[PDB]
């Protein structure tokens, strides 16, 4: 339920913030945080390898449980739902009857005080994690492992989900958030429900300063540079591309496919994304 502001500054006119309604605990679990080491986009050489990064708010990393087959059969109580700055989804704090505590990605509809569980015979209920083979066809899932025991990889951002389309041998057929149809092995775990905070995409940043808070530094158009810098650099006055639109490194950037041709996972993709 995105929140608006009155136009009492030029930037507040368009700014929108999340409503934070589902959040019930506004300080993180101390035993689950780690320092999240900012890179500035620099690699172990000191070199910028992702441009225009740096300068965002400090964050602590909240450890998330992307396995959940760790505690088959052990139910847990949803203790709280919290803000996580490392991701668009909210995170749910789980109190296992074990006494163990863990974070998961908070699906949509998950309520504080309800119980979730993981395993081959967990109920088909929002927040539960089962091998994909034991989830009925048609079910909406998130936090989908891509290969057994390797960790949840697919449908993790706010609002996203995958749907189970059908079965074929040891594999199930998912329609991923991008609309691609793909075979994922049946022993891969997944979590009933869609990721929460679907309003996330409607947030209007509002001002340049907001991008700066997020660690996003200003992006410079190639057309704004000189030929030492960019295919689009130079020209007297403004200038159209004057060549096929290109990246700073010269490769074409309107249409040119880039997935590796002979990639082994091609056997497991039924339909490439559309639209």
Residues 146 and 188: beta-carbon distance below 8 Å: yes
Does 113 bind RNA (CB under 7 A)? Our answer is no
Phi, psi of 63 (to 5 degrees): -65, 135
Q: Minimal distance in Å, beta carbon 110 to RNA?
A: 16
Show the binding pattern over residues 153-182: x = contacts RNA (CB under 7 A), - = does not: xxxxxxxx--x-xx---------xxx-x-x
67 touches RNA (CB under 7 A): no
Q: Element (H or E) spanning 213, and its range?
A: helix 208-213
User: In angstroms, what is the minimal distance from the CB of 66 to RNA?
Assistant: 7
Using the contact rule CB under 5 A, the part of the chain among 61-69, 126-134, 213-221, 259-267 near Mg ion is 213-221
List Cβ neighbours of 138 (8 Å cut-off, separation of 6 or more). Answer: 163, 164
State which residue, 46 or 169, has the beta carbon closest to RNA.
46
Question: Is residue 124 involved in binding RNA (CB under 7 A)?
Answer: no
Interface map 179-208 toward Mg ion (x if CB under 5 A): -x---xx---------------x-------
Q: Which of 10, 99, 169, 240 binds Mg ion (CB under 5 A)?
A: 240
The rounded distance, in Å, linking the Cα atoms of 222 and 236 is 15
Q: Which residues pair with 115 in a beta bridge?
A: 77
Contacts of 249 (CB under 8 A, 6+ apart): none
CB 218 to RNA: min, Å: 3
102 by DSSP, 3-state: which? strand
Judged by CB, which is closer to Mg ion: 121, or 254?
254
> DSSP strand E in 112-228: where?
115-116, 129-131, 140-142, 144-145, 152-154, 162-168, 171-175, 181-185, 189-192
Among 1, 44, 138, 254, binds Mg ion (CB under 5 A): 44
* CB contact at 8 A, 75 and 99: no
Complex with RNA: residue 65 or 128, whichever CB lies closer: 65
CA 214 – CA 220 distance, rounded (Å): 17
Kindly tell me which of 137 and 150 has the beta carbon lying closer to Mg ion. Answer: 150
Residues of this chain that bind Mg ion (CB under 5 A):
4-5, 15, 20, 22-23, 41, 44, 48, 50-51, 53, 56-57, 83-84, 90, 147, 180, 184-185, 201, 214, 219, 221, 235, 237, 239-240, 242-244, 246, 272-273
């Amino acid at each position: 339920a995105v929140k608006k502001f009155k136009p009492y500054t030029p930037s507040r006119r368009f700014m929108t913030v999340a409503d934070f309604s589902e959040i019930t605990k506004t300080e993180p679990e101390k035993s689950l945080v780690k320092p999240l080491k900012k890179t500035g986009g620099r690699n172990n050489q000191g070199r910028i390898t992702v441009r225009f990064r740096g300068g965002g708010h400090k964050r602590l990393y909240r450890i998330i449980d992307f396995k959940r087959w760790d505690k088959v059969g052990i139910p847990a109580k949803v203790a709280a739902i919290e803000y996580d700055p490392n991701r668009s989804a909210r995170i749910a704090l789980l109190h296992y009857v074990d006494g163990e505590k863990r974070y998961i990605i908070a699906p949509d509809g998950l309520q504080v005080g309800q119980q979730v569980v993981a395993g081959p015979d967990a109920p088909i209920q929002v927040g539960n994690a089962l091998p994909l083979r034991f989830i009925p066809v048609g079910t909406v899932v998130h936090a989908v492992e891509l290969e057994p025991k390797k960790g949840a990889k697919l449908a993790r951002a706010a609002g996203t989900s995958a749907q189970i389309q059908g079965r074929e041998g040891d594999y199930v057929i998912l329609r991923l958030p991008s609309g691609e149809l793909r075979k994922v092995h049946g022993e891969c775990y997944a979590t009933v429900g869609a990721v929460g905070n679907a309003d996330h995409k409607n947030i209007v940043l509002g001002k340049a300063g907001r991008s700066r808070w997020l660690g996003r530094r200003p992006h410079v158009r190639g057309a704004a540079m000189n030929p030492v810098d960019h295919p689009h650099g130079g020209g007297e006055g403004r200038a159209p591309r004057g060549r096929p639109p290109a990246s700073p490194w010269g490769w074409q950037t309107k249409g040119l496919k880039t997935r590796k041709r002979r990639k082994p996972s091609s056997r497991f993709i039924i339909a490439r994304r559309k639209k």
